[PDB]
Amino acid sequence: WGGFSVSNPTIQRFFALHYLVPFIIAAMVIMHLMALHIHGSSNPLGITGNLDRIP
Amino acid sequence: EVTQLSNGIVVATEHNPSAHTASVGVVFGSGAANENPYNNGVSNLWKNIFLSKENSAVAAKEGLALSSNISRDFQSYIVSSLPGSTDKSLDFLNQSFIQQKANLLSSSNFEATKKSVLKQVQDFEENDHPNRVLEHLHSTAFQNTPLSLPTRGTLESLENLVVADLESFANNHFLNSNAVVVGTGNIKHEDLVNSIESKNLSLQTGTKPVLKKKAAFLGSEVRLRDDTLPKAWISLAVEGEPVNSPNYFVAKLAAQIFGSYNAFEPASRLQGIKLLDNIQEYQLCDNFNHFSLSYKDSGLWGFSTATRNVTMIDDLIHFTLKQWNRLTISVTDTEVERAKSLLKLQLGQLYESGNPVNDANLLGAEVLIKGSKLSLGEAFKKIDAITVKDVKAWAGKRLWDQDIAIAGTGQIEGLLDYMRIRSDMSMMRW
Ligand code: HEM
């Protein structure tokens, strides 16, 4: 809280955090697409998809 | 000089006193486009019957050599001999091919020829990739139209034939109004006409069947992928010009601009072809060539290539099609000047080779469409008259944003989808 309850020290640090975290999500999405690229997407049949690929 | 007389059958002759051989032949205006998917391969079977062991033996006893050629628009049967014996070739052609066909269509001979042709077609379909890829390109370009039937015939259809199909085809297509009698080498036109007149040499009545559908081009592709082969073979083409088009020679020159390339010959790496500047660095291909093929109803303009770089196919196709794009907008005069002389030498060897069989085939196939044979000299002036504006006008019509046909086999997994290739036919920067 930065104090004894929710007051000025709370909101003023909640906003500066709110501007930061989306830049962390954007960095985790980059790491999220890095783990998606090693093996690729799946298909609804649940079987191998390496036989028929399109760009 | 080329001399043609319409008396009797259309008789064409090209005299060359220097040659030590003479060819006499018959060229028919029917080909693999005159047959249907159920008797496909009847022309090849007729060819192999004319080339059978007994017929060839009786021919070679007199001292004669037999040639047969099957194509989309004509069938050629040629007898070649020494200049003194040119009259004997007519006698053999009359006695064997024309007058009687019962002996050649016996049961045992037909079965043996059928089994040999089946073996040949079976070997072709599995162990000859660059040519069967071109055959599939034809079959996918002109599908459901006469021009797409393979000239050798399919394996499944060749089994169903009997002698009845052969004799029916002979009745329907071997006619006086469909035939040209050709003479090449050391023979005179007057002597040839006199020799024909002494005999009857009548083929049949006439009125060959007329096809109900004219050949049409469809943008399409066929992929025959096989991962047990070491390379990938690819043939790509667009619609071209037919025979008797005003833009025939412009088409051949535009083809000659890009030419052919072999990676292992040291000289062909120094050619003025600018395309090589993009290919040579990463060894994209082993060989390529460019073609402008013309038929009676339509044509094909494109290239064919083979490569072991199975991971860089799209780069090869991309660079080739960007070189094609350059024709419409920014072709330069030096390119055309080099192309003129390269084409003239290219046409020069084709029409002026020593072997008279090629001359006979060309003259017979030419007079069956044009009605006369263009001279070598008049060919050059049209070649020399070609300018940059003509090349741009032809390219803006025939290959700018036009449908394509593709056929490939082997490790063609790197070959991208159809649309990605189709989009490369324009630049989008112009
Ligand atoms: C901004 C947030 C996110 C973005 C932009 C994102 C983007 C993507 C993309 C582009 C793919 C590949 C395409 C697809 O499968 O549809 C993917 C796959 C996947 N994502 Fe996400 N994702 C996000 C959040 C999440 C979350 C929150 C989860 C799980 C709680 C998740 C789990 C997955 C899984 C399991 C796959 C694989 C699906 C498959 O291959 O069938 N993602 N993601």
mmCIF file with all atom_site columns, all heavy atoms in Angstrom, chain B residues 310-321:
data_model
loop_
_atom_site.group_PDB
_atom_site.id
_atom_site.type_symbol
_atom_site.label_atom_id
_atom_site.label_alt_id
_atom_site.label_comp_id
_atom_site.label_asym_id
_atom_site.label_entity_id
_atom_site.label_seq_id
_atom_site.pdbx_PDB_ins_code
_atom_site.Cartn_x
_atom_site.Cartn_y
_atom_site.Cartn_z
_atom_site.occupancy
_atom_site.B_iso_or_equiv
_atom_site.pdbx_formal_charge
_atom_site.auth_seq_id
_atom_site.auth_comp_id
_atom_site.auth_asym_id
_atom_site.auth_atom_id
_atom_site.pdbx_PDB_model_num
ATOM 1  N N   . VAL B 1 310 ? 17.863 -28.555 -53.091 1.00 0.00 ? 310 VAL B N   1
ATOM 2  C CA  . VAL B 1 310 ? 16.446 -28.795 -52.827 1.00 0.00 ? 310 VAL B CA  1
ATOM 3  C C   . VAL B 1 310 ? 15.903 -27.802 -51.809 1.00 0.00 ? 310 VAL B C   1
ATOM 4  O O   . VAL B 1 310 ? 14.708 -27.808 -51.493 1.00 0.00 ? 310 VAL B O   1
ATOM 5  C CB  . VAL B 1 310 ? 16.229 -30.246 -52.365 1.00 0.00 ? 310 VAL B CB  1
ATOM 6  C CG1 . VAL B 1 310 ? 16.523 -31.210 -53.499 1.00 0.00 ? 310 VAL B CG1 1
ATOM 7  C CG2 . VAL B 1 310 ? 17.096 -30.551 -51.161 1.00 0.00 ? 310 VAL B CG2 1
ATOM 8  N N   . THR B 1 311 ? 16.766 -26.947 -51.262 1.00 0.00 ? 311 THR B N   1
ATOM 9  C CA  . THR B 1 311 ? 16.308 -26.015 -50.237 1.00 0.00 ? 311 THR B CA  1
ATOM 10 C C   . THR B 1 311 ? 16.199 -24.593 -50.777 1.00 0.00 ? 311 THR B C   1
ATOM 11 O O   . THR B 1 311 ? 15.745 -23.689 -50.068 1.00 0.00 ? 311 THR B O   1
ATOM 12 C CB  . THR B 1 311 ? 17.241 -26.063 -49.029 1.00 0.00 ? 311 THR B CB  1
ATOM 13 O OG1 . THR B 1 311 ? 18.589 -25.840 -49.452 1.00 0.00 ? 311 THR B OG1 1
ATOM 14 C CG2 . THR B 1 311 ? 17.150 -27.417 -48.348 1.00 0.00 ? 311 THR B CG2 1
ATOM 15 N N   . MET B 1 312 ? 16.612 -24.372 -52.025 1.00 0.00 ? 312 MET B N   1
ATOM 16 C CA  . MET B 1 312 ? 16.592 -23.044 -52.622 1.00 0.00 ? 312 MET B CA  1
ATOM 17 C C   . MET B 1 312 ? 15.878 -23.012 -53.971 1.00 0.00 ? 312 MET B C   1
ATOM 18 O O   . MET B 1 312 ? 16.323 -22.307 -54.881 1.00 0.00 ? 312 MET B O   1
ATOM 19 C CB  . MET B 1 312 ? 18.018 -22.516 -52.767 1.00 0.00 ? 312 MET B CB  1
ATOM 20 C CG  . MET B 1 312 ? 18.712 -22.252 -51.442 1.00 0.00 ? 312 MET B CG  1
ATOM 21 S SD  . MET B 1 312 ? 20.405 -21.672 -51.637 1.00 0.00 ? 312 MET B SD  1
ATOM 22 C CE  . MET B 1 312 ? 20.159 -19.904 -51.528 1.00 0.00 ? 312 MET B CE  1
ATOM 23 N N   . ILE B 1 313 ? 14.782 -23.758 -54.113 1.00 0.00 ? 313 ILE B N   1
ATOM 24 C CA  . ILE B 1 313 ? 14.056 -23.798 -55.381 1.00 0.00 ? 313 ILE B CA  1
ATOM 25 C C   . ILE B 1 313 ? 13.348 -22.474 -55.639 1.00 0.00 ? 313 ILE B C   1
ATOM 26 O O   . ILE B 1 313 ? 13.359 -21.943 -56.763 1.00 0.00 ? 313 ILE B O   1
ATOM 27 C CB  . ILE B 1 313 ? 13.066 -24.975 -55.377 1.00 0.00 ? 313 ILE B CB  1
ATOM 28 C CG1 . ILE B 1 313 ? 13.823 -26.301 -55.398 1.00 0.00 ? 313 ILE B CG1 1
ATOM 29 C CG2 . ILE B 1 313 ? 12.115 -24.882 -56.551 1.00 0.00 ? 313 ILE B CG2 1
ATOM 30 C CD1 . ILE B 1 313 ? 12.940 -27.505 -55.220 1.00 0.00 ? 313 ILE B CD1 1
ATOM 31 N N   . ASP B 1 314 ? 12.719 -21.920 -54.600 1.00 0.00 ? 314 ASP B N   1
ATOM 32 C CA  . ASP B 1 314 ? 11.927 -20.711 -54.774 1.00 0.00 ? 314 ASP B CA  1
ATOM 33 C C   . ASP B 1 314 ? 12.787 -19.538 -55.218 1.00 0.00 ? 314 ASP B C   1
ATOM 34 O O   . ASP B 1 314 ? 12.333 -18.688 -55.986 1.00 0.00 ? 314 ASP B O   1
ATOM 35 C CB  . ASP B 1 314 ? 11.171 -20.389 -53.483 1.00 0.00 ? 314 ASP B CB  1
ATOM 36 C CG  . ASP B 1 314 ? 12.093 -20.130 -52.309 1.00 0.00 ? 314 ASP B CG  1
ATOM 37 O OD1 . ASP B 1 314 ? 13.325 -20.251 -52.464 1.00 0.00 ? 314 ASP B OD1 1
ATOM 38 O OD2 . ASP B 1 314 ? 11.581 -19.799 -51.222 1.00 0.00 ? 314 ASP B OD2 1
ATOM 39 N N   . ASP B 1 315 ? 14.037 -19.477 -54.752 1.00 0.00 ? 315 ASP B N   1
ATOM 40 C CA  . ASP B 1 315 ? 14.945 -18.431 -55.214 1.00 0.00 ? 315 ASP B CA  1
ATOM 41 C C   . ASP B 1 315 ? 15.212 -18.548 -56.709 1.00 0.00 ? 315 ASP B C   1
ATOM 42 O O   . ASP B 1 315 ? 15.224 -17.541 -57.428 1.00 0.00 ? 315 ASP B O   1
ATOM 43 C CB  . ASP B 1 315 ? 16.254 -18.494 -54.429 1.00 0.00 ? 315 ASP B CB  1
ATOM 44 C CG  . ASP B 1 315 ? 16.127 -17.910 -53.043 1.00 0.00 ? 315 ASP B CG  1
ATOM 45 O OD1 . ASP B 1 315 ? 15.062 -17.338 -52.736 1.00 0.00 ? 315 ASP B OD1 1
ATOM 46 O OD2 . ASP B 1 315 ? 17.088 -18.024 -52.258 1.00 0.00 ? 315 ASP B OD2 1
ATOM 47 N N   . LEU B 1 316 ? 15.422 -19.774 -57.195 1.00 0.00 ? 316 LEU B N   1
ATOM 48 C CA  . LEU B 1 316 ? 15.626 -19.994 -58.623 1.00 0.00 ? 316 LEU B CA  1
ATOM 49 C C   . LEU B 1 316 ? 14.421 -19.517 -59.429 1.00 0.00 ? 316 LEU B C   1
ATOM 50 O O   . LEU B 1 316 ? 14.566 -18.754 -60.396 1.00 0.00 ? 316 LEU B O   1
ATOM 51 C CB  . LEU B 1 316 ? 15.897 -21.478 -58.873 1.00 0.00 ? 316 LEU B CB  1
ATOM 52 C CG  . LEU B 1 316 ? 15.903 -22.018 -60.302 1.00 0.00 ? 316 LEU B CG  1
ATOM 53 C CD1 . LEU B 1 316 ? 17.068 -21.458 -61.091 1.00 0.00 ? 316 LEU B CD1 1
ATOM 54 C CD2 . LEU B 1 316 ? 15.955 -23.532 -60.280 1.00 0.00 ? 316 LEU B CD2 1
ATOM 55 N N   . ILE B 1 317 ? 13.221 -19.940 -59.025 1.00 0.00 ? 317 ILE B N   1
ATOM 56 C CA  . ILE B 1 317 ? 12.014 -19.549 -59.754 1.00 0.00 ? 317 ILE B CA  1
ATOM 57 C C   . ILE B 1 317 ? 11.814 -18.037 -59.700 1.00 0.00 ? 317 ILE B C   1
ATOM 58 O O   . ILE B 1 317 ? 11.460 -17.406 -60.704 1.00 0.00 ? 317 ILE B O   1
ATOM 59 C CB  . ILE B 1 317 ? 10.795 -20.310 -59.206 1.00 0.00 ? 317 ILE B CB  1
ATOM 60 C CG1 . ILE B 1 317 ? 11.032 -21.819 -59.271 1.00 0.00 ? 317 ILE B CG1 1
ATOM 61 C CG2 . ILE B 1 317 ? 9.538  -19.945 -59.975 1.00 0.00 ? 317 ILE B CG2 1
ATOM 62 C CD1 . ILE B 1 317 ? 11.014 -22.380 -60.667 1.00 0.00 ? 317 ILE B CD1 1
ATOM 63 N N   . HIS B 1 318 ? 12.040 -17.437 -58.530 1.00 0.00 ? 318 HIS B N   1
ATOM 64 C CA  . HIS B 1 318 ? 11.878 -15.999 -58.354 1.00 0.00 ? 318 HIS B CA  1
ATOM 65 C C   . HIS B 1 318 ? 12.801 -15.210 -59.275 1.00 0.00 ? 318 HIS B C   1
ATOM 66 O O   . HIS B 1 318 ? 12.357 -14.290 -59.974 1.00 0.00 ? 318 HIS B O   1
ATOM 67 C CB  . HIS B 1 318 ? 12.133 -15.661 -56.883 1.00 0.00 ? 318 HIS B CB  1
ATOM 68 C CG  . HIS B 1 318 ? 12.296 -14.204 -56.598 1.00 0.00 ? 318 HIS B CG  1
ATOM 69 N ND1 . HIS B 1 318 ? 11.244 -13.315 -56.622 1.00 0.00 ? 318 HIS B ND1 1
ATOM 70 C CD2 . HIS B 1 318 ? 13.387 -13.484 -56.246 1.00 0.00 ? 318 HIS B CD2 1
ATOM 71 C CE1 . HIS B 1 318 ? 11.684 -12.109 -56.316 1.00 0.00 ? 318 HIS B CE1 1
ATOM 72 N NE2 . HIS B 1 318 ? 12.980 -12.183 -56.085 1.00 0.00 ? 318 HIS B NE2 1
ATOM 73 N N   . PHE B 1 319 ? 14.087 -15.567 -59.303 1.00 0.00 ? 319 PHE B N   1
ATOM 74 C CA  . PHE B 1 319 ? 15.028 -14.836 -60.144 1.00 0.00 ? 319 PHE B CA  1
ATOM 75 C C   . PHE B 1 319 ? 14.717 -15.024 -61.625 1.00 0.00 ? 319 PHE B C   1
ATOM 76 O O   . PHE B 1 319 ? 14.795 -14.064 -62.408 1.00 0.00 ? 319 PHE B O   1
ATOM 77 C CB  . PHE B 1 319 ? 16.455 -15.269 -59.820 1.00 0.00 ? 319 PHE B CB  1
ATOM 78 C CG  . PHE B 1 319 ? 16.986 -14.674 -58.550 1.00 0.00 ? 319 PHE B CG  1
ATOM 79 C CD1 . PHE B 1 319 ? 17.568 -15.471 -57.581 1.00 0.00 ? 319 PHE B CD1 1
ATOM 80 C CD2 . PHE B 1 319 ? 16.900 -13.313 -58.323 1.00 0.00 ? 319 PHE B CD2 1
ATOM 81 C CE1 . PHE B 1 319 ? 18.052 -14.922 -56.414 1.00 0.00 ? 319 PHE B CE1 1
ATOM 82 C CE2 . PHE B 1 319 ? 17.383 -12.758 -57.158 1.00 0.00 ? 319 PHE B CE2 1
ATOM 83 C CZ  . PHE B 1 319 ? 17.959 -13.563 -56.203 1.00 0.00 ? 319 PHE B CZ  1
ATOM 84 N N   . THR B 1 320 ? 14.346 -16.241 -62.030 1.00 0.00 ? 320 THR B N   1
ATOM 85 C CA  . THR B 1 320 ? 13.993 -16.464 -63.429 1.00 0.00 ? 320 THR B CA  1
ATOM 86 C C   . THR B 1 320 ? 12.796 -15.616 -63.841 1.00 0.00 ? 320 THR B C   1
ATOM 87 O O   . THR B 1 320 ? 12.799 -14.982 -64.905 1.00 0.00 ? 320 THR B O   1
ATOM 88 C CB  . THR B 1 320 ? 13.703 -17.944 -63.668 1.00 0.00 ? 320 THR B CB  1
ATOM 89 O OG1 . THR B 1 320 ? 14.878 -18.712 -63.388 1.00 0.00 ? 320 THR B OG1 1
ATOM 90 C CG2 . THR B 1 320 ? 13.284 -18.172 -65.105 1.00 0.00 ? 320 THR B CG2 1
ATOM 91 N N   . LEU B 1 321 ? 11.760 -15.581 -63.003 1.00 0.00 ? 321 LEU B N   1
ATOM 92 C CA  . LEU B 1 321 ? 10.560 -14.848 -63.384 1.00 0.00 ? 321 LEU B CA  1
ATOM 93 C C   . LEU B 1 321 ? 10.795 -13.341 -63.356 1.00 0.00 ? 321 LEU B C   1
ATOM 94 O O   . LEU B 1 321 ? 10.179 -12.600 -64.128 1.00 0.00 ? 321 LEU B O   1
ATOM 95 C CB  . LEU B 1 321 ? 9.393  -15.252 -62.488 1.00 0.00 ? 321 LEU B CB  1
ATOM 96 C CG  . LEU B 1 321 ? 8.460  -16.301 -63.112 1.00 0.00 ? 321 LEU B CG  1
ATOM 97 C CD1 . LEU B 1 321 ? 9.234  -17.513 -63.599 1.00 0.00 ? 321 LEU B CD1 1
ATOM 98 C CD2 . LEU B 1 321 ? 7.385  -16.729 -62.137 1.00 0.00 ? 321 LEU B CD2 1
#
